[PDB]
Amino acid sequence: QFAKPEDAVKYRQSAGTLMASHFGRMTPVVKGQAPYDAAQIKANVEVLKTLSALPWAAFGPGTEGGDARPEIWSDAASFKQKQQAFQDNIVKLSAAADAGDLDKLRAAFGDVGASCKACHDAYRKK
């Protein structure tokens, strides 16, 4: 769906912006600094699940640019493992939110954040 590589770059950066907002806005809730409303969190995690599926199709071959490292394309299999594992971590967060279970939500939130960071450390330029 991208006329030039620059359009794929703009798309995946905007998806990252929205993912950071929908993930990070739950930090005060998992810390107990803001109240826990199970329905509010269930709906927010639904939005995060949709968004978290979107970046990967915008790293098609030849779309190099932005702060993407070249290791994404020459090692297709390792990059795919990382995005699939990340989306699995999001399934655990969705199961916790759907159950209304704050203990499971805290643990799943930490695992999701670690997965964001592990990919950025390997595949995003400093």
Nearest in space to 49 (alpha carbons), one of 15, 79, 94: 94
The answer to whether residue 41 forms part of the interface with ligand NO2 (CB under 6 A) is no
Distance CA 100, CA 38 (A): 5
Structure-token pair, residue 53: 């599926």
Is 120 annotated to bind a ligand? Reply is yes
Annotation-wise, does 12 bind a ligand? Answer: yes
In the bound state with ligand NO2, the residue whose beta carbon lies nearer, of 15 and 30, is: 15
Q: What angle do CA 43, 44, 48 make, to 5 degrees?
A: 120
Residue from 62, 49, 69 nearest 5 by CA: 62
Candidates 26, 83, 93, 97: give the one binding ligand HEC (CB under 6 A). Answer: 83
- Two structure tokens written together for 104: 């499971």
Under rule CB under 6 A, residue 51 binds ligand HEC: no
CB of 67 to ligand HEC, least distance (A): 4
- Can residue 55 be called a binding residue for ligand NO2 (CB under 6 A)? yes
Which residues form the interface with ligand HEC (CB under 6 A)? 9, 12-13, 16-17, 19-20, 23, 66-68, 82-83, 86, 112, 115-116, 119-120, 123-124
